[PDB]
Amino acid sequence: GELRVGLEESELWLRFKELTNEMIVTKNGRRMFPVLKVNVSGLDPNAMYSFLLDFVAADNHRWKYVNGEWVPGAPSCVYIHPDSPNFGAHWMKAPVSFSKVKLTNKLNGGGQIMLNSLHKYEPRIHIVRVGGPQRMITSHCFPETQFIAVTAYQNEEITALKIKYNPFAKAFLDA
Template sequence: RRMFPTFQVKIFGMDPMADYMLLMDFIPVDDKRYRQVMPCPPCGAQYAFHSSSWLVAGKADPATPGRVHYHPDSPAKGAQWMKQIVSFDKLKLTNNLLDDNGHIILNSMHRYQPRFHVVYVDPRKDSEKYAEENFKTFVFEETRFTAVTAYQNHRITQLKIASNPFAKGFRDCDPE
């Protein structure tokens, strides 16, 4: 599945003529597994998203294989990256440990921190000597999330459908 909401970033400060690769990976926030607790069991009451919470449900499952997602436009000139918002809308997540499509594998009900990496494509023949200075990692703590297989909140489901250009068949028909 595609990550929702999509990670988007505005970039500045690059050398406009240099080549860069943009990529993302995901690291576990902690060594715990979570479960969502709702204020009222399924009793017909309206689900209150703002009052639900995540509780620790035990120790984390074994770590998934670490994978990296390269932005499909990589590598590209700094000028291209800086001219508009960069969207990772092609990034796909899965909980399938046997995935062979290159998707990012995450454990459901575990917390993750996305990391955004900018890699300068060094034209020097001995560029591996400078590898450490040729990349920068950015972590935005507000992008932390709990991986789920299904949304527990119908409003979030509707928001995703409304935002998904491929979900035309799921949208309510407006007769007007």
């Protein structure tokens, strides 16, 4: 196939993956960091597509953080990228960033993807053809972006990188 989906900023994602990544989930929705950003080529530049994001279990068991390490102890709803629907040229000319998806531990509203806390999840992206002869769906999972949903950060080394890179955490970037 012509389609090519690449995870942008993989170096940054692997820095979090190494220490086991954590994404805060809140009742009101919490943005991800790092932000999932995808590079796409191979779409028809003049065809219409919608990008979808959901979250798949990365394993089967509940997780627990004890003594500085992670120990064992259903697919989410889908989020539509706010640029959808759009032509393939739009999706290809710049990386598709899911900067506005919010993760939550309660089904309290729309636009927020509910996650079960202390479980490992893998982001999965779907490219949906809009108005073609037939339905085209492609799935793309990125192992580098696996994480455990938490209500509070467990590994402080993750907290440090979150502070180091998320501009919204700049006030804590003193140390």
